């Protein structure tokens, strides 16, 4: 017979799936082992090898005694794991130095083996053995002994047991030259516990597990088919017909996909995905020491396989569109009819569902973070559980358990899906205790275990359990957007109306209560979550639309035979809308450019709009009170107003968002907008790089001074300069920064530079200059003083503008003046910045062959005050009769903090970012700017080692200072330790093509402290047990 066959098959297949799937984590795996030796080509030349883990698994080194005899009297590095002139190299690295009397080994601010030099060069000493491993950091000087102290007579071994004392390796640097001596050699064993590939056994077990689970579910299907019920071959009318709500939702989703905003964590996911295939494992790439997101990481591998085609924004986030359409179909054609005949008979409920799904999908679930996919999985789970309860079969329950497992394996906030299994638990238990009689217990229970457990074969493919435990150890040791509450405003009324009246005429109790309990359970899980509650709201997009479709029926006049309650509900909706129109931080970093309200709350007329909604709420509530006092019923006006409040509210918010985005596009057309760039991607577009402009050499367009008799200030002051002095700038003023006395991460080389220069400029200046300006070609004038103050003027010489041509005039849209002080100028974030006057006065050549002025131009001064920053003067605001131009500066403030400093102007020689950086140079793109710079190549990493970057792109000042500098600091596991220790940064002069007051971000050039070349690593392989760990990593002292 076939029933007994299917029983046996189900049992054996499910048990095998459970066993093998539990065993996948503990099974062996092949790891590639890299190691690094510094003398490579038999010559003493420096070498770079930036480890992303900021420490090796072990280090050994051997140094003869003769090398000390070869250096000069003032020797230096015999070797070091970072350059001696680097930033905090003596705090983060190993250094073997010779200070003219002592041969010192300095591990991180710790002096191990400090020994005289006249002994090491003697005839007794032979070698120096240095070893840093988990057992400690020790150094032995063979042939010698301790002469002084309590340790006298015993060997010259010295050091400390501390596994957190292992150095940070970004190379092997020295000061020696020539051939290599016999014995000098280091050996670093790099940590590569994450980059692996499976054995044949593990792979075969995973494949057999998936096959057996499929076999078991097929056999359980053949067992569920024992009842005479069948699926009819015809499709129903609802899946065949099409409506207008379908068109509205689909069109809105498409238009928002192209034109609309994007989430905040996009570059995070994109850079992880792009670097995963070269690495060999999904790394976070910004934090936590190259540790993976592998326990919740398979969607990222889907994105990584997608990146092999293109990295555009219109392709990599197609899953959002797919999942949106799937949610809409499953919600309109499987969720609403099963709630009852009332729902799916009305149109208002369908409009409510569609519009709420739109409004919740818009700010959050358009991007790359998987919140919308989680919502889709939860909806699929609910649908399959309801189909199981209705049809009485157990296969959709198993498929729903599988879907819940995967939805949890996307992101830890997928536990919402599991809530469905907690709601539809007792029905499935009833089914199991009902079918236990006909067929036994194990044929049913085994496939469910196999379904729940098959996720371990996908989640632990390229990883083991020890790696995951280590990654969690690091993540726990180190630390860790319009408001929408349609969810709550729809959960409260449906809840109270299901509690008030027991049974509703034409509505199902079970499905509604299950949906409501799902939502309450996940809100419970989320209030315990340390992250802010409002950020995780895209999970309630589809289920929230379902609850809205339910709520629009439980408040209509067909059930609520009282007007006062409906007016109260209207007051509630309007109060909610006011609370959502007030609390809005804005949009995030590229959608907030052309939006109407960028630095305020909405304000039309003469007072904010939230006040108008609170006022409408007040009228509604007082009207309800009057209805209560007149004790009337069934007034036609209320039946006209309270026909459908929720769809009207949702449509209002939808139209608001779409209008904001379309206004941002039309107001900001030729330069960057999300929609314009995405439309441009089909034609070879590259995003913000196409619009952003940069000066390769920031001294290229300095204008020629006309002839004149001038003073010691030079041509810049001019014929009566008062209160301006060439060295009139404070000690430490730098480019786009403030130079706090205590340091910060991710800072340029200008911070730690000296105060004064060794050689003065043309005029008697000593001030450093920001953007690579050579003080032998660029004068300065400033008014800061310390003995007594005075009112200061400056009116420079007429600087001859270049020429009168059209192509040149098109390529040269600016005249720029570098200045530091409190200067007035327009902007976007904060317009009309009050302060002192630095203006650009232009001329028109008279008929006598002589000059005479016409007017002035006011700048666009974006950037931190009182930093060295570029002041922008467009050439569109200048008449084409212009031939000459001068600076006019006034200081009418006797306070010691209101000071001015200026340089001469320049018509820069610009070009785009894509024309200079290209798509082959490595770049350190922060986690905010990856979706606008897709064509740029990030700094990959493979086998523990990274690539030395040549550039760094970053967001605006406050975001760089508050978000990225702190996230990927070296103390927390980021990449800026490597760059701060190995490289020296310098900020560049960048502009945006037609928004001269917008702060798109910053571009920084990296230069090398010392000349060096990449390393030739040595490879091998080892097979592990699955539970193997070579001790813990270094994360903390
Ligand atoms: C990767 C994501 C794939 C999602 C699949 C969703 C398909 C939805 C649209 C299909 C068109 C159907 C037209 C049939 C028209 C039709 O006859 O309706 C098919 C059936 C309802 O059938 P009838 O209406 O004939 O049912 C009898 C009733 O009329 C009487 O009550 O609806 C379903 O069961 C749909 C749900 C399938 C869901 C299966 C999902 C299982 C795979 C899980 C994927 C996991 C994703 C992981 C997380 C991201
Ligand atoms: C009831 C059964 C339902 C179907 C269950 C899924 C079927 C199995 C398909 C994936 C097995 C993994 C691939 C083999 C594993 C293998 O042999 O290669 C393991 C491979 C090791 O490669 P290396 O470490 O050399 O490099 C990989 C790197 O290049 C990328 O990280 O790592 C991967 O590529 C990670 C796999 C990502 C997996 C992406 C797929 C995620 C599942 C998508 C389907 C989920 C929805 C299911 C609907 C219910
Ligand atoms: Ca791997
Ligand atoms: Ca002053």
Numbering used by the authors: 21 to 500, 526 to 1082
Text taken from the publication that reported this structure:
EmbB and EmbC have mutations known to lead to ethambutol resistance, while a clear effect of the drug on EmbA activity has not been established.
Here, EmbB appears as a monomer, consisting of 15 TM helices and two distinct periplasmic carbohydrate binding modules (CBMs). The next 11 TM helices adopt a typical GT-C glycosyltransferase fold, structurally similar to enzymes from various glycosyltransferase families: mycobacterial AftD from GT5315, archaeal ArnT from GT8316, yeast Pmt1-Pmt2 from GT3917, and bacterial PglB from GT6618. Conservation analyses reveal that this cavity contains highly conserved charged residues (D285, D286, R389, E391), where the residues corresponding to D285 and D286 are required for catalytic activity of corynebacterial EmbB (D297 and D298)19 and mycobacterial EmbC (D293 and D294)20. Based on this structural comparison, the lipidic donor (DPA) is likely to bind in the pocket formed by TM helices 7–9, on the right side of the cavity, with the soluble acceptor substrate binding to the left. We observe two bound lipids in our structure, in a pocket formed by TM helices 2, 5, 6, 7, and 9 on opposite leaflets. A tightly bound phosphatidylglycerol lipid and calcium cation that likely serve a structural purpose were evident in the density map, and their presence and identity were confirmed using native and denaturing mass spectrometry. Focusing only on residues conserved between M. tuberculosis and M. smegmatis, we found that mutations causing resistance all cluster around the putative active site. Notably, these mutations are closer to the putative DPA binding site, suggesting that ethambutol might interfere with recruitment of the arabinose donor, thereby inhibiting enzyme function.
